[PDB]
Design a protein around this nucleic acid. Sequence first.
DNA 1: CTGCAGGGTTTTTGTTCCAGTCTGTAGCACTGTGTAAGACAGGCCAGATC
DNA 2: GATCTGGCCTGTCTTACACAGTGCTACAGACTGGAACAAAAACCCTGCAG
Lengths: 614, 615, 351, 351
Amino acid sequence: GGRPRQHLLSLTRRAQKHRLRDLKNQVKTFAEKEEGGDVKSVCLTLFLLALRAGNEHKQADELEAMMQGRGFGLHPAVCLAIRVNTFLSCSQYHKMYRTVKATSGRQIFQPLHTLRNAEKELLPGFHQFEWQPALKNVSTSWDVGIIDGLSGWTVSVDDVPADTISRRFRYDVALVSALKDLEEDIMEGLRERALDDSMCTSGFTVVVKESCDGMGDVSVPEKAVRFSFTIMSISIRLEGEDDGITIFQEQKPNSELSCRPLCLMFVDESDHETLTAILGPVVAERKAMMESRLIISVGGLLRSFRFFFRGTGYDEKMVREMEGLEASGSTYICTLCDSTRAEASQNMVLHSITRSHDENLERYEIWRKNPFSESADELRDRVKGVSAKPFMETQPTLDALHCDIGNATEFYKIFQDEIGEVYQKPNPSREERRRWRSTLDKQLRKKMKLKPVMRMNGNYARRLMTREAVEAVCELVPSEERREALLKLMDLYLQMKPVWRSTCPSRDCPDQLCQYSYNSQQFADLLSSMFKYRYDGKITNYLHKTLAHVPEIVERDGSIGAWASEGNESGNKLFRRFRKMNARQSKTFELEDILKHHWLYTSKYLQKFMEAHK
Amino acid sequence: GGRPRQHLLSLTRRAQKHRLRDLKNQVKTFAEKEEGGDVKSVCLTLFLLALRAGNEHKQADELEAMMQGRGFGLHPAVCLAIRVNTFLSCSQYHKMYRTVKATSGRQIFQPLHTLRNAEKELLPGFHQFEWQPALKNVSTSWDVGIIDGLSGWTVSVDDVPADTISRRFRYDVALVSALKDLEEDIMEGLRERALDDSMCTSGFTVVVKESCDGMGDVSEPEKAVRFSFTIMSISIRLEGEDDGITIFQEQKPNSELSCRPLCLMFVDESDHETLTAILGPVVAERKAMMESRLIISVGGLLRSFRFFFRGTGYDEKMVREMEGLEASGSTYICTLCDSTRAEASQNMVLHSITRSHDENLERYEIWRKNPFSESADELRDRVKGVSAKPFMETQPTLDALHCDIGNATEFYKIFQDEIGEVYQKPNPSREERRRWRSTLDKQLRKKMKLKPVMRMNGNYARRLMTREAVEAVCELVPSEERREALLKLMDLYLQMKPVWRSTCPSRDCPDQLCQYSYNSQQFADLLSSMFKYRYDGKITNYLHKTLAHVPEIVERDGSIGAWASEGNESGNKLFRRFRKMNARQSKTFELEDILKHHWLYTSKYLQKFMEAHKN
Amino acid sequence: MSLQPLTAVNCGSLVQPGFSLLDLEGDVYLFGQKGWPKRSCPTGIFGVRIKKGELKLRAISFSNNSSYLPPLRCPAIAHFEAQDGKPECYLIHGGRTPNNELSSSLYMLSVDSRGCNRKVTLRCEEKELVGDVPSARYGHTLSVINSRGKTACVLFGGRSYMPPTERTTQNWNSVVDCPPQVYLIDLEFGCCTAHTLPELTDGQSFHVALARQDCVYFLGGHILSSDCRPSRLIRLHVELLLGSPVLTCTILHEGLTITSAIASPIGYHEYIIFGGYQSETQKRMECTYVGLDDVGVHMESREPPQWTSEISHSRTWFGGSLGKGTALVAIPSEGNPTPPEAYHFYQVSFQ
Amino acid sequence: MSLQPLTAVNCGSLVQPGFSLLDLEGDVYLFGQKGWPKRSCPTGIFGVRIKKGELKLRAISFSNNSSYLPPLRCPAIAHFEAQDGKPECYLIHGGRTPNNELSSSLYMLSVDSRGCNRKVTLRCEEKELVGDVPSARYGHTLSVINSRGKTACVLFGGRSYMPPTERTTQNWNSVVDCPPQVYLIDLEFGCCTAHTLPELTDGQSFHVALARQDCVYFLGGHILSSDCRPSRLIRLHVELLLGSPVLTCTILHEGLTITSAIASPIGYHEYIIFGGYQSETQKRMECTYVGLDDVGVHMESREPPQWTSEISHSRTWFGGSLGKGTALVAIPSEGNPTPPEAYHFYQVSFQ
DNA sequence: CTGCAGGGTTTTTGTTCCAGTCTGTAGCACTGTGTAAGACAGGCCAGATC
DNA sequence: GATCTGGCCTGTCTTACACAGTGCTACAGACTGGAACAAAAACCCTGCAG
Ligand SMILES: [Ca+2]
Ligand SMILES: [Ca+2]
Ligand SMILES: [Ca+2]
Ligand SMILES: [Ca+2]
Ligand SMILES: [Zn+2]
Ligand SMILES: [Zn+2]
């Protein structure tokens, strides 16, 4: 006879121990033999391995998280970080938080009030500092925050209409916030370089990249202007005796995820007056900071800083604007060489870089006074297109994104052209170009899987550069010489294109850079011969620059692409999404909010706490 | 010699097994020899008893909550609900998910796959059923999902085009979905009634109200209608003398959280063609539904269900446009009696209810044949303005909201005419009327602190029909006789405003209903005495209705605010919020998604989790 | 053969892509308006005016003994030739209602008196039909014939939904063609008879046909079953003998692959097609004169008027003939914002 | 004395509120342009032609020995009357730079040759200042005097950015009244000397003063230190004694509270003051006229021409005399979308 | 006793395969397909006078 | 009246300006078993190094 065997997990713990005592002794003595009496860890490990044999990873992770410490709640930092990282309203966050708190709470998330404090150490206007020498014509107050861009603008109706609403910070405070953020990583790099952390702490060097682009369709577009900056690369000279050591160069400056906005204004990008009226103070204070030095408690030590500023992150027309170049298809084609448009057909490579800010100021004054009584367009010639007193100094360089987009549309256009005929039909009519573009996009669609676009898009250009689209379309070409010729041109382009796309070719790929002059010469002369009909004397500007200035600027300023305004443009999406669903509909405060929210979006503190081990 | 051997918990699981192989196979063979080969239960009990030996009761109880207790955070349900309850898109949800997973390990939330499947538990077309008798002219397929309203609309350009984009559910399916949702509270009402459950499985009584109302300002064609409906209550008819005991009764019917959409189409409210062409099958199933008995596994028990409906949720305009009457300002205004225009002014208190959908059909037939060979206006009069064929049965009831809106605009222009002196100047001029408009605007901007609008919202109405607004504007009308006149006017008006605005006037203001007859008659006679200046023979239809129809309808049905349709209006805001945030966006998918989201938005099985654990 | 673009002054919404025109003694009346009548025009029929490129409409009234008629959409239209007993009727049956339902009812339209001032009085008599009555259907065809010298009127064609037994909530707009069966009808009394033909392999719809002198030609349309537009011709020689009106038919070599065209009359049996639809996606665009004779039907191509690029680029187009070799058409207007006149309007003529 | 709704054919976007309208040798010339000069016309100035309520703007060209001028925004204007040795001049100083800057630089503008073909040559000379020079200011007021019998130039008024020490980046767009010093300049040589006035309480702006036969009359304007608008004009007389230009002032107790008005000289010294701003919101709608004398102001309010609801409703406005009792005013316009001629234009005349 | 190279040790750690499965991340249809400013070239042309 | 020409017109060119985030789907990567295998991490162990 006997008692029937029931399920082991249903009887009392008395019967459990009864039926398991033998294996309990086995596990006890095994733990004592192999690990010295650790029954708990041995039974734990065996249970976990038995669970994982069935591929039940989830419950094993659950139980292990319950053991060896816990994750009951959350730190407030990552909480607010996540909140801003997915563009939620305070109402939303509260509903969700109260909800989950009601359910197995154990309140994990955190309520709003604690968040809305936990960031004043991240938002600007919070960290004490000072300068030596003092900043000229600049308040020493280290506490101020969001300021309406009006700059104490007299509301006087009789005078200039004081109309536009704007917001911004004080440039210095944004810089020092950026530093105090990166401080953890500058200390990390100090340790990586193993240099002393106590001394050699007064001669750092921070590279600043400024940038500004307009942005339409922000509702009439309402066409508001965005202005941003970014820390590019911080170096150190101390204690001297050397050139400088880059502690932290940004790895992905292209990414908008490291691009902090500084000033927002509800104005068009073209109207110069209001633009200046709200930009002047900023450029003035930047010029002021160029001389003095900053003092900040970083790494517990009162260290010091000086800076260097690169005016790159801009479109062409704006550069011309705040430089005073006659936008855009002027007789003076290049911002950086002074050649004529026409003469840029005879020569296309040998060109020097002399266009510098103060020089342009001098040339403008020589325009104004005309110390030579010379004729009007004569004055235009001698000044070399300098007739508009500029104010904003910029680094004389081009953006990668725009060179790419312009050369992409040039490619697209010439493809539509030579699908029809140019050197066998000299003067084509408008409907001809229309039908040629239609059938060109037909070819680009049937294979290569691209849909047409009203304007040039970035990834659109990326695919527009693939040789495979060329092999697809050029099949439509009747010629063989010109067909394989445009193939070879695409070839040269692919060979020498990533040169400016590169982050640092001197470290990425010096090869093409060494023969960049040579391939540029090849392609330039191939165009001059096989396509003189189209480029007799008229030249797209970006092509002039890339065929007459790329290697020099690459040699001078570290690299290119590392300064493209591309990340600026990307931020528009942010400013789009932000304006969509995180505000009360009030203008005086819409920017006052959107700034705060967006300024959050860029923090290695926050971004790291967001990655959290991938 | 030998390498120092580390702590078992810190080794690699490969090396952990490499070194534990002995006791691994020992526990394996112990399970196989003594416990039927269940290694999992063996090691579970090993860890359990080892922990409980060290006074680790808290960790042991938490583990026992993990094994055979669904831990792993909180639930798939509340996860999906919270996803809905704040309109969060999927990529965002996954971004938060991976985040809270990496930092603060032991993920609480569910991944995407879990909630995708969990949908079909609350999507329509998941619980089986059938009809006795079988549903006529209806496919018996029960597992169907979303269907575009074309109902096989052949796309022949030779014929009328299929240019209209629409989506819908199958009526019965959303019905059974909502019921199976509310099986929880139906079992709980059975509980509260201390009522049997094995018995009384046949005499359930379910009543639903419905609505349909388009809206403009949808662009960047242009308009769409959101046909919806919601259960109101459910009682018990078994087994005799007991007429019915309300088992469930809705508490917030006017609320948005009780508004179940069924079908949406990118159409205008006006063109009667497309509306019928789409909603036809809905009408057919509606009428085919009154008869058969539905079988549902409610509370695990297969029980029968029957249904009564009362079409209420329609504005005056649509009410007419599905009744074929004169739209809108013709001699026939009472959608219930056959009053003329001036007769509603002649007598303003003595009217009965006559307009009955069946009689509407019967008299449209008279229009059709004219069996008496009568003239156009002659037959129109004899037929009392039955001008077209009726199309769908609605209960001859009133909308409280837009009737209040009519009271509001009427008293508004009363004020606009009392700032000036129309009883002295019977024909004032347009520009003087606009000046009186602007001075009324500034008057109510100073007092009561209200801004002007070109078209009015409900808050404007309620904040206008206030004795404080009366005495604020009365300061401008100089005649202290007209002041007291319209003061007592507003007084007696508010003496009855809650009568129709009551959710349960039988309780919320029964004495207010009792004297309603006298209050309304005083209203009409005061019109005839001092305000006849305007109401010689011309009135507004809504007033007519609030005078001679309120008590009849409410006594016959129970309330008005109960059958009020308000929700759909502000729910249009929700429809917009949904579309511009969660759209695909692709026309064949825009509705095909927003409908899902929307239907999800209104399950008590979710909303309780917002209020259930909150109080 | 000329076209001229017109712009209607005070009418921009009442017509719908499927509508109709009816002429009584040179007087034009539009039939079929979008939705039920407002308080404005409780009849829905409009006397039409085309003068100096402008298009005006005016409302009509009726007698008292004349019952009123809801706005059918695509019925079969038949001008009863003015003869004994009652000139001059014009037949209406039966189309589909505003509420997407079908009439299956016979109305006779007539003039009563005038004026005073260019006013015309009309009348509508619903006559019950005895049978063996036809089922509800729409897009069908019916015409009159005389057999020494009896008068009959015969119908065939049309689409309709599935029978109510299989009528399905998901097929509620699915439709098929009618069975290939004609229905002969004496107007007095309202007798109806159904008949099938062995040559009549399949039903159809949208098809236009012309009758004359006891014989009819059934011309091209499209059949939804095989999705074909068979360009053959049907021709039935029919006669009325007491009391069985026997009926024979034949298939000619070629008819035409056209669909739902605009047929204008010019002579007794000299008629002209202004194009219907050749393909489901591609419109036929040229004219085609067709006479019919006792010898037979005789058809010839013609010069098509110089189409506007816009009418050339419309996706749809439709209408009827103003009569006597003149027609009116409209084109869905494309604009955001809409004009909101949903249609450009053109007036075409021959010679 | 009435208006006329003009229409600027093109270039309806190159006109900010603040600009200058200089009349010499017949035709009128617009100075000051929104944004820096395009290559369309480098010198920025435009010759104005009014034809049929239409506005034509012809480009201008300078001499070769001339200088080039930035479009100063709210500058000080002076008509130097035709007399030896170079008739007849305009004087522009010192203005607001379009790129937001100030220029204390002084500009002498004149006409040089014409045409032959109606194209008129102009020229500009930077007149260096020695002193005791006037600081860079804007909205200030300078005129010309001829006392016993020699000619000088009197400047007063105008604001300025905060001093270059208290120039706060957060107050950068603040601007207060310049210190109240009169500036007496000979065009040759530029011996610009400043002079105090113990009665002149403070600086001011937009005070459209006037001088007659070396006797100046400052009508009240705006004082930002007080936001007040004391109407009373202040008379003063300057006496070019050798070598001390002695001065006298007098507080006339009756004037007019006006800011930045339009003054058309009608007679030799008869000036109609059109309109401006008597308040922050209440614009001077009424017209005005003063005959000038040794007795001085002799003021009458003429009949104010009718005003379109357009000009009534707009927040502010601006303009300038076309000379000869005639003027042009503009209104910041609206339109949906942007017209983009953001200003509607109205001519106005006397008699 | 030191020095280092390298003899042994057990213990990480991956190492090979055939079936899964649970997940996260990639790929996707997709809106709409012209704008707006200014430079410069030249065509023409009125107006005005030579 | 001739002309011519200063300027206005029309056209063509060149540089920015919009289209991404979204639910759905499919695949890939990431995990379970046995054997027996190299390669290392670091103790210890020996041998040759003074
Ligand atoms: Ca740009
Ligand atoms: Ca851009
Ligand atoms: Ca409404
Ligand atoms: Ca409405
Ligand atoms: Zn260059
Ligand atoms: Zn009534």
